[PDB]
Design a protein around this ligand. Structure first.
Ligand code: CDL
Ligand code: BCL
Ligand code: BCL
Ligand code: BCL
Ligand code: BCL
Ligand code: BPH
Ligand code: BPH
Ligand code: SPO
Ligand code: LDA
Ligand code: LDA
Ligand code: LDA
Ligand code: CL
Ligand code: FE
Lengths: 240, 281, 301
């Protein structure tokens, strides 16, 4: 009858849909590799999809996925076992080297632009008309690390102009230079900003940005990866 | 094997129990101590379900059903064949669910990300425990719990609901249904909005978050934004499950009459309770 | 630790008049105020809104639907505001009696008003649909919102329009009332032998529950990786960063399959539209083709 026909029709449609969906989610990170980087023999049941091409705004070219994958940076790790499946030990400083939870991806050394072609993120001192409108203004507060020591003070907020939100604190260190701190990794309090991820001695190691009025997508990743990695790698200096 | 970008994340550490003992993967799967625990509880539960199928006399998946003890066993144990298997399996299922949440915390620590996912998953574990643990304990018998069976768990929903008239009248049920409905709407919009920007009119360049905020403002006058939409989806669905657990923890415990009759507090309010006409008097 | 559910600091700049593209700027309002309250969770800015011919048409229609129902509620209350307040949930604007078939000749007090209000609702919703399509066109975006919106319109069209016509009477349609539309739903299932046996109801429930699982996982994830700029999803599609990598590896290490930044949004749109798509088929077949889902399920078909 007509209802059994409808419910068989649907299950076949759903099989096709799941297939389409699984292959759409294969457009990054494939083909699979062995831990030495050569292509794995077994790539799974579904094949790769035909490539698609994104036209990027503002004259920044195209992207085609799937397409040639390369880390485009050195990975300072070594095998800890003789068979597949075990962890890879850092061979140096995992925070200096950008591995594990401190990892960064080699994105474009360009800033993200808004719908008009201007830099998305600007320090507030250069964003006309932008001010703190609610909450505690962190500018001027000292910054405390997880070792309960003071590493610097907030000298600006870097803001998302089109989305009107704070994205980075700009911290001045005891030697006069500044670093960016992700907003999502600080705790603003009445009389201080507290940073759980980093101990005070690790602030100088935060990657620095090359022009002082803009931050590129690559530097954003290095900064954020570094700060997040301190949760694992700076635990020998965390207190309650 | 490994995603092309995966090797740099497969570092030692982040575990909560065991140190480096179970700090390894099987194919794509992280294991960890709670990976082993999950496998142990799951394996045990499955075996116990197959044993339940032997005692019940059928192997059809649409017919297998593990029932709780009868109501007369109160909150004691019961023989295996008559509710004991449900009791052990219920323990196993809790072990597997909690181990799953904790294995996720371990995955979160290695990856250096926040704990929002396992936290969200704990609300689903909470709704399950309301149905099989908190509510039966408060009502004084395991028998008020639901059976493990594809279709019989549905029969329990119908019977339990109709014990109180049309269950639609539970006011916490009403609120929970709203969050479920609003969640699905917000998920459709969120998916539609990102894709419509990534995938513009043919030959046009990729749009920007600005186009996304412009679209919603043009349409309804307000855009919650790209961080807010994800805050919203988290809150909408966690709320829906919270009010689900609530709508059942109060049913049969503090309210046990027909749910439609609860609404007579509004109607009987003294200033209008005797004005004639309308629908009520 | 900081969770990113609410913002610690709010910043504000000039009001964002928005992207222009091919939009007719003559039809954008002024910006509303800024809400600090909304600012803790999402954006603070209200406005502007776009109102063209379709927008006025849809809004005037929808108000006329709302008012027609509320005028009837006042009549049932004998125009007594205390009765109106007391019995608000119990008032109901019912469709014509079965005797009137699909005819428009039913008297106002016995269904004709239901038809007026349904006509206003019919206009209101389809105008709004064309509006979701044309707002996307002006900005140069895909029509994903309009097509997804179509999936909800389908269930609504089935309940109040297509099924009544196939059944041959307007009385099959849903009444306008709080408790009465709840009763109608309960009644519908009893009369068709338990909707729990309707396999499309069962799938619909799966996608509804699944939608909650998915938005829970997706929103939790993006907040979990918002320390790496994760919520900036379009740029992460154009130029994968460590947020997208870590979000994928969570899903891989947890349950073994892959999820890209774009891919996860295809799951999102489909999980959601499938709720009302399958739902509409389950209602459409109830009473037209299948009288009793329990009986139907006994022959498994
Ligand atoms: C018995 C019951 C049987 C079940 C019946 C189910 C009927 C469902 C039909 C769904 C529509 C077909 C899919 C489609 O249009 O492809 C979109 C197409 C393009 O999407 P995109 O790349 O995002 O768009 C880029 C464009 O430039 C931007 O393009 P755009 O802006 O034009 O939007 C593209 C796309 C985007 O829309 C979607 O992808 C959302 C899907 C919502 C569909 C809801 C319709 C409900 C109506 C009732 O919208 C459509 O083309 C939908 C057409 C209108 C539907 C009528 O890709 C898919 O999603 C493929 C679907 C795969 C389905 C598997 C089929 C199984 C085969 C075995 C049988
Ligand atoms: C789908 C099966 C039934 C149905 C069964 C239920 C049940 C069961 C419940 C509701 C609930 C509600 N339904 Mg109803 N409802 C249906 C069709 C509709 C239609 C329609 C098709 O036009 C509308 C406008 C409503 C409207 C409403 C609201 C009064 C309320 C919350 C919805 C919500 O949060 O949405 C999200 C959108 C927003 C703008 C917010 N229902 C059909 C006929 N509805 C709940 C409630 O609280 O009722 C008092 C409730 O318990
Ligand atoms: C005749 C039936 C009654 C009725 C009686 C009931 C009863 C009875 C109950 C509900 C409850 C609910 N009803 Mg009601 N309900 C009716 C009509 C409706 C309508 C409608 C349109 O009419 C709607 C939308 C709803 C909606 C809902 C929700 C508010 C809620 C279910 C979600 C939930 O608890 O998730 C919570 C999620 C879970 C429990 C899932 C947990 C999953 C676990 C943690 C992990 C699973 C792992 C799994 C084993 C792994 C699988 C293996 C794989 C290999 C990995 N009801 C009618 C009037 N309703 C239920 C509720 O609120 O429960 C708390 C409930 O008990
Ligand atoms: C939530 C409120 C009610 C309830 C009311 C309903 C109603 C009403 C319906 C279901 C439906 C289903 N419910 Mg139930 N159900 C509840 C509690 C549960 C629990 C639990 C808490 O342990 C589980 C595991 C299930 C499992 C299921 C499936 C048999 C089915 C599809 C689920 C789905 O898509 O979810 C959303 C999840 C996803 C999309 C992710 C993938 C989930 C997979 C498919 C789960 C497979 C579980 C498997 C069959 C049993 C595991 C056994 C062991 C592994 C051996 N229900 C409580 C008692 N459930 C529907 C159905 O068709 O039933 C016949 C249906 O109509
Ligand atoms: C006693 C009651 C019966 C029952 C009777 C029904 C009936 C009858 C129906 C459902 C339907 C549904 N049921 Mg059931 N259901 C029962 C038990 C359950 C249980 C459970 C026990 O746990 C659950 C979880 C569900 C779950 C579900 C949903 C999956 C599904 C509705 C989808 C949806 O999004 O609708 C909500 C979405 C809409 C109604 C779409 C609305 C779109 C329109 C265009 C919006 C216009 C808004 C308008 C302009 C007003 C705006 C106001 C202002 C702008 C703010 N049912 C029992 C067995 N159920 C529906 C379905 O599809 O079944 C197959 C349905 O019709
Ligand atoms: C995928 C299925 C889910 C969904 C999807 C969905 N709904 C949608 C859309 C989409 C993709 C829109 O684009 C559209 C919208 O504009 O949202 C902001 C809409 C929308 N879904 C709405 C409501 C709604 N959707 C519902 C359902 C759902 N919609 C499903 C769960 C429900 C439920 C659960 O019953 C309701 C009440 C509106 C907010 C809007 C459609 C607006 C509309 O038609 O307006 C016409 C009416 C007026 C202008 C005046 C109304 C009278 C007032 C008293 C004033
Ligand atoms: C809180 C919001 C929603 C939510 C969220 C959510 N679910 C989640 C997560 C989150 C955030 C996860 O992180 C986690 C996950 O990893 O998903 C991919 C999970 C997940 N939610 C799942 C299911 C699920 N979630 C549901 C609901 C919801 N999940 C909520 C609506 C439902 C519903 C509505 O019914 C189901 C069925 C899984 C896919 C997964 C958890 C997997 C897990 O715990 O694996 C360990 C357990 C086993 C491998 C099997 C153990 C077997 C037992 C020992 C025996 C069987 C006992 C059982 C009681 C029998 C019952 C069968 C009958 C009822 C038919
Ligand atoms: C404050 O008081 C005043 C008077 C100012 C205003 C008061 C307003 C009030 C109290 C409003 C209350 C509104 C309520 C309670 C509304 C509830 C609505 C509900 C619950 C609706 C539920 C479902 C509706 C559905 C499924 C409707 C579907 C309708 C259609 C698909 C339309 C089909 C079209 C038809 C039949 C007509 C077509 C005719 C032609 C000629 C094309
Ligand atoms: C009901 C939509 C959600 C809130 C948006 C309200 C309308 C925003 C437009 C306000 C602008 C009008 N005005 C007079 C302030 O300029
Ligand atoms: C569950 C509530 C829904 C969120 C809506 C807006 C809530 C306002 C939250 C304000 C809290 C911010 N504060 C003051 C703690 O910094
Ligand atoms: C795109 C997500 C795929 C999820 C599908 C899950 C199917 C579970 C429900 C199947 C059983 C329901 N029923 C009645 C049709 O048998
Ligand atoms: Cl909550
Ligand atoms: Fe997203």
């Amino acid at each position: 009858d007509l209802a059994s026909l409808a419910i068989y029709s649907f299950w076949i449609f759903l099989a096709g849909l799941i297939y389409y969906l699984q292959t759409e989610n294969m457009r990054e990170g494939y083909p699979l590799e062995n831990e030495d980087g050569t292509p794995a023999a077994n790539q799974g049941p579904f094949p790769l999809p035909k490539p698609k091409t994104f036209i990027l705004p503002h004259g920044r070219g195209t992207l085609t996925v799937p397409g040639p994958e390369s880390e485009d940076r050195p990975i300072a790790l070594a095998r800890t076992a003789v068979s597949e499946g075990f962890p890879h030990a850092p061979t140096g400083d995992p925070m200096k080297d950008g591995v594990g939870p401190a990892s960064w991806v080699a994105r474009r050394d360009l800033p993200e632009l808004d719908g008009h072609g201007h830099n998305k993120i600007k320090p507030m001192k250069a964003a006309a008309g932008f001010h703190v409108s609610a909450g505690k203004n962190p500018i001027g507060l000292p910054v405390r690390g997880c070792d309960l020591e003071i590493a610097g003070k907030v000298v600006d907020i870097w803001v998302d102009i089109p989305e009107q939100m704070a994205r980075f604190l700009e911290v001045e260190l005891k030697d006069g230079s500044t670093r960016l701190l992700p907003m999502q990794m600080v705790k603003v309090q009445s009389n201080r900003v507290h940073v759980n991820a980093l101990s005070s001695d690790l602030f100088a190691g935060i990657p620095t940005i090359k022009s002082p009025t803009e931050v590129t997508l690559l530097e954003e990743d290095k900064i954020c990866g570094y700060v997040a990695g301190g949760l694992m790698y700076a635990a020998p200096k965390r207190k309650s | 094997a490994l995603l092309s970008f995966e090797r740099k994340y497969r570092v030692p550490g982040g575990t909560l129990v065991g140190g480096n003992l179970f700090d390894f993967w099987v194919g794509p799967f992280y294991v960890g101590f709670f990976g082993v625990a999950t496998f142990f509880f799951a394996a045990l539960g499955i075996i116990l379900i197959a044993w339940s199928a032997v005692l019940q006399g059928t192997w059809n998946p649409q017919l297998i059903s593990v029932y709780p003890p009868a109501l007369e066993y109160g909150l004691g144990g019961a023989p295996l064949a008559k509710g004991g298997l449900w009791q052990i399996i219920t323990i196993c299922a809790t072990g597997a669910f909690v181990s799953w949440a904790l294995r996720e915390v371990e995955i979160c620590r290695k990856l250096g990300i926040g704990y929002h996912i396992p936290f969200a998953f704990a609300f689903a574990i909470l709704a399950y425990l309301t149905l099989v643990l908190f509510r039966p304990v408060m009502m004084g018998a395991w028998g008020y719990a639901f059976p493990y069976g594809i279709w019989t768990h549905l029969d329990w929903v119908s019977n339990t609901g109709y014990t109180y008239g049309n269950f639609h009248y539970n006011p916490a049920h009403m609120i929970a249904i709203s969050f479920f409905f609003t969640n699905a709407l917000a998920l459709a919009l969120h998916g539609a909005l990102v894709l419509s920007a990534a995938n513009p009119e043919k030959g046009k360049e990729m749009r920007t978050p600005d186009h996304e905020d412009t679209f919603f403002r043009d349409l309804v006058g307000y855009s919650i934004g790209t961080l807010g939409i994800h805050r919203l989806g988290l809150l909408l669905s966690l709320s829906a499950v919270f009010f689900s657990a609530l709508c059942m923890i109060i049913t049969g415990t503090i309210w046990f009459d027909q749910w439609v009759d609860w609404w007579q507090w509004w109607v009987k309010l003294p200033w209008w309770a005797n004005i004639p006409g309308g629908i009520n008097g | 630790e900081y969770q990113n559910i609410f913002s610690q600091v709010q910043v504000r700049g000039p009001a964002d008049l928005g992207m222009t593209e091919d939009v007719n700027l003559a039809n954008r309002s002024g910006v509303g105020p800024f809400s600090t309250l909304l600012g803790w969770f999402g954006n603070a800015q209200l406005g502007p809104i776009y109102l063209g011919s379709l927008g006025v048409l849809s809004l005037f229609s929808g108000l006329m639907w709302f008012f027609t129902i509320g005028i009837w509620f006042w009549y049932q209350a004998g125009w007594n505001p205390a009765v109106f307040l007391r019995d608000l949930f119990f008032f109901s604007l019912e469709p014509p009696a079965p005797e009137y078939g699909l005819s428009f000749a039913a008297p106002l007090k016995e269904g004709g008003l239901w038809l007026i209000a349904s006509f206003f609702m019919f206009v209101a919703v389809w105008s709004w649909w064309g509006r979701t399509y044309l707002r996307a066109q002006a900005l140069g975006m895909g029509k994903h919102t309009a097509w997804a919106f179509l999936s909800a319109i389908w269930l609504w069209m089935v309940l109040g329009f297509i099924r009544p016509i196939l059944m041959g009477s307007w009385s099959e349609a849903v009444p306008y009332g709080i408790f009465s539309h709840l009763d109608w739903t309960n009644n519908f299932s009893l009369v068709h032998g338990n909707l729990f046996y309707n396999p499309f109801h069962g799938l619909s429930i799966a996608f509804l529950f699944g939608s909650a699982l998915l938005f829970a996982m997706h929103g939790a994830t993006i907040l979990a990786v918002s320390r790496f700029g994760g919520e900036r999803e379009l740029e992460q599609i154009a130029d994968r960063g460590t947020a997208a990598e870590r979000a994928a590896l969570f899903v891989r290490w947890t349950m073994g399959f892959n999820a890209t930044m774009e891919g996860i949004h295809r799951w999102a749109i489909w999980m959601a539209v499938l709720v009302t798509l399958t739902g509409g088929i389950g209602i459409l077949l109830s009473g037209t083709v299948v009288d009793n889902w329990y009986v139907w399920g006994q022959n498994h078909g």
